[PDB]
């Protein structure tokens, strides 16, 4: 409305000065704009220069537009409506400016406005844009489509929200009118728009699906890459949610996608390749592939080679390899006749790129085809071992990974034939001069450590020699993997790590990196998780190290809780904290408490850990509760004297976290209640027992959750209970003989004495591999008691019948 000459000359002057090649003039223009941007009339001038000053050249008009855009995304709340509306009007009025740079700038402006200040503060953006599609001038329709496309991209919840009153029941049938359109750009926009609303199963589209699918087929023949790409990705998404609709055309579709997977445009080929990934998740995959699988496997295998440019994330190679992995899991051994001739031509090829693809294939199919591959492994594994010292780094690294994919088989064979040389050469490769090899080797060794477990004990010194040595060699990316390897080693070899030499060489560099990291460095996550395992493993010895670690961890929990409260108080000024610092800190405290046990009392005596835990147990985030209940169980065992005052408060929460939807929260709560039981509690039993019985009869997690529930129910055995013995026995008969099993069986003996039942499982379960004498006498006293109280015992399998004469017949 009111641009005056002095103002215009001054702002144009500032834009010219901002375009100076001189670096100092730029920095002071920066502070000058810094000040000016907070005055709305300045924004009025900026938009005026963008849209009205035809006189000025394009980079000036565009720079004005972009500065304005930055202001509209750090200061838009404080914009009054008169200026906002002047910008809005001028944008929609200039959306099709004949300069591409101006057009693009206006576009960023529109989309950034819609973004920062939500789509309803602009009630009429979409309607005008939509009507602007029908306009004559090409640039106008192109610009409007571009804007809509961006809006649909990031503002996708336009249908599920319904804030602007069904903002898609108009647009979608309008996009589908433009599939037919003469210009490739507009077709592309139309499809890219619609595509945003497929996986959501958006009503407006779903009730137009036939028109959609038909127009897509009509488009299949299009040679403009962006259209092919978008059709391809349309079909891929459609395949996930409306399978029914495309069954009748699947043969022709598979033919099309298989053609496009071989497309010369990398992007088309990649979008096509997604088809195999998502098709492999549908149960009709085999039936649909019967006519095409023989061609499909070699195309994927061939696409798994590194690209020419890659020889220097998601790409054709990775997609193809993932597709092969899933197909291997679908077809299992039926795939091997398709894949073995390719492997024979690839694994020994003289061109390293081809060999590399072969090793990749060999790894990819491992999970699905493991059984079928066993016959060939006595030849392939030694060969892979040789490849570990291939002179091409990318061969070494992929070999590392594939071997790790066959670690189980390697471990199950005699150690000297495969395991020993593999571990030796993996260790060598950990100290490779190539960083990709280094991390591949460390990761693969971690996987092997995990599978081998105790089988590593004899090589412990050489392993530690290498892992420690890696500290001085490794950069940042790779220290993370190194910590994971140390952690898994400690978990694998347990207490065997507790030797003075090992502690002295391992701990100092761990503390060294501990001292470098600040409480805000995410690189704490692997180190602390490593320390937790080391602490649990080093049981006796860590003592000289616990103090700073305990304090720092507790402190991290404290400051996390603080930041969370502060953010809950003022979200617009204080960042929500990353709760992983808290989860990891709890997890290390759990490990410390398990390792040191009772010897952590002195540290807990000086601590508010229980008061922090009280808030952790009530956290919204499941992993925080799971960690806090774990720490609760460990401290219950280690130093109950500090916990007892809190039990009356803690128990109703444990009672409210016996929800099997969260397996590990429910589990850790249950375990906690078992440990606390042993230290105690009649009034708390009713709030927990019914749920535990529900959990033990539930047809899910027939493993660790049920055993702990059983143990806990067993522990709650020292009460007047009133079945559940069927799954209890079923669950507990399969666990190793330890203290927990003892406690639970004492409970079942006391409980049977009070309400004797007519479903012997107990007897089958009673077959203890060497129970302590008092527990045995309890058993044979109850058994003998029943015998004093057959055709039924005829049904005992021989091992049972025989065992129950050695101890109690």
């Amino acid at each position: 409305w009111k641009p005056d000459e002095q103002g215009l000359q001054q702002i144009l002057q500032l834009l010219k000065e901002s375009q100076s090649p001189d670096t100092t003039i730029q920095r002071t223009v920066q502070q000058k704009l810094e000040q000016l941007n907070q005055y709305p009339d300045f924004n009025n001038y900026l938009i005026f220069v963008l849209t009205k000053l035809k006189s000025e050249d394009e980079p000036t008009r565009s720079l004005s537009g972009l500065i304005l855009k930055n202001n509209v995304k750090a200061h838009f709340q404080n914009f009054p409506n008169g200026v906002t509306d002047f910008i809005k009007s001028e944008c929609l009025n200039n959306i099709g400016d004949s300069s591409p740079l101006i057009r693009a700038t206006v576009g960023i402006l529109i989309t950034t406005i819609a973004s920062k200040g939500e789509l309803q503060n602009w009630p009429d953006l979409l309607p005008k844009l939509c009507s602007l599609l029908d306009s004559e001038d090409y640039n106008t329709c192109e610009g409007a489509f571009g804007a809509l496309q961006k809006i649909c991209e990031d503002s996708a919840e336009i249908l599920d929200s319904d804030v602007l009153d069904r903002p898609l029941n108009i647009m979608i049938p309008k996009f589908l009118q433009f599939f037919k359109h003469s210009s490739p750009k507009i077709r592309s926009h139309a499809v890219a728009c619609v595509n945003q609303f497929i996986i959501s199963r958006t009503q407006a589209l779903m009730l137009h699906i036939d028109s959609f699918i038909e127009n897509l087929f009509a488009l299949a023949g299009d040679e403009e890459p962006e259209v092919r790409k978008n059709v391809c990705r349309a079909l891929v998404m459609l395949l996930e949610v409306r399978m029914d609709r495309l069954l009748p055309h699947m043969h022709n579709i598979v033919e099309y996608m298989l053609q496009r997977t071989q497309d010369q445009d990398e992007n088309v080929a990649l979008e096509a390749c997604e088809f195999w990934l998502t098709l492999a998740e549908q149960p009709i995959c085999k039936d649909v592939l019967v006519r095409h699988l023989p061609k499909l496997i070699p195309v994927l295998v061939n696409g798994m080679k590194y690209s020419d440019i890659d020889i220097i994330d998601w790409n054709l190679r990775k997609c193809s390899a993932a597709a092969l992995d899933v197909l291997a899991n679908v077809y299992r051994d039926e795939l091997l006749p398709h894949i073995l001739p390719l492997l024979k031509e690839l694994l020994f090829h003289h061109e390293w790129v081809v060999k590399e693809s072969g090793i990749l294939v060999l790894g990819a199919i491992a999970e699905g085809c493991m059984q079928g591959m066993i016959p060939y492994l006595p030849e392939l594994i030694p060969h892979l071992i040789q490849c570990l010292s291939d002179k091409k780094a990318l061969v070494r690294s992929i070999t590392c990974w594939t071997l790790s994919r066959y670690a189980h088989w390697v471990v199950s064979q005699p150690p000297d034939t495969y395991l020993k040389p593999l571990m030796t050469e993996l260790l060598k490769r950990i100290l490779d001069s190539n960083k990709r090899v280094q991390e591949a080797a460390c990761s693969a060794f971690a996987t092997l450590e995990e599978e081998a477990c105790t089988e590593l004990v004899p090589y412990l010194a050489y392993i530690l020699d290498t892992l420690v040595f890696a500290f001085s060699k490794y950069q940042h990316k790779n220290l993370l993997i190194l910590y994971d390897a140390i952690g898994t080693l400690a978990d694998s070899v347990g207490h065997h790590l507790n030797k003075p030499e090992y502690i002295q060489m391992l701990m100092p560099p761990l503390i060294q990196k501990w001292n470098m990291l600040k409480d805000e460095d995410k690189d704490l996550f692997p180190l602390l998780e490593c320390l937790s395992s080391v602490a649990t493993a080093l049981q006796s010895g860590f003592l000289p190290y616990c103090e700073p670690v305990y304090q720092r961890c507790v402190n991290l929990v404290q400051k996390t809780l603080a930041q969370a409260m502060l953010n809950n108080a003022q979200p617009d000024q204080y960042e929500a904290p990353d709760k992983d610092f808290m989860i990891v800190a709890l997890d290390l405290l759990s490990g410390l408490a398990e390792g040191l046990g009772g010897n952590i009392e002195q540290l807990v005596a000086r601590s508010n850990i229980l008061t922090l835990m009280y808030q952790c147990m009530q956290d919204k985030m499941p992993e925080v509760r799971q960690s806090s209940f774990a720490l609760l169980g460990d401290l219950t065992k280690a130093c109950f004297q500090h916990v007892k005052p809190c039990i009356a408060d803690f128990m109703p929460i444990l009672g409210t976290n016996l929800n099997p939807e969260f397996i590990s929260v429910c589990n850790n709560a249950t375990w906690a209640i078992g440990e606390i039981s042993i230290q105690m509690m009649q009034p708390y039993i009713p709030m927990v027992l019914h749920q535990l019985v529900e959990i033990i009869n539930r047809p899910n997690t027939p493993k660790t959750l049920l055993e702990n529930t059983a143990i806990t129910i067993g522990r709650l055995g020292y009460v007047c209970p009133q079945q559940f013995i069927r799954p209890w026995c079923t669950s507990l008969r399969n666990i190793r003989d330890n203290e927990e099993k003892d406690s639970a069986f004492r409970g079942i003996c006391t409980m049977i004495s009070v309400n004797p039942d007519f479903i012997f499982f107990c007897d089958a379960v009673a077959s203890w591999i060497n129970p302590k004498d008092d527990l045995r006498d309890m058993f044979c006293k109850i058994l003998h008691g029943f015998k004093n109280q057959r055709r039924f015992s005829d049904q005992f399998p021989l091992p049972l019948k025989e065992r129950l004469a050695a101890f109690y017949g």
């Binding site: 190679r317 992995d325 990974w401």
Partner: peptide
């Protein structure tokens, strides 16, 4: 019998993978 922790899963997530 005992607590469930996520350490191992977190390490597998961080582990090097070709795809």
């Amino acid at each position: 019998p005992g607590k469930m922790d996520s350490r191992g899963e977190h390490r597998q997530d961080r582990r090097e993978r070709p795809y």
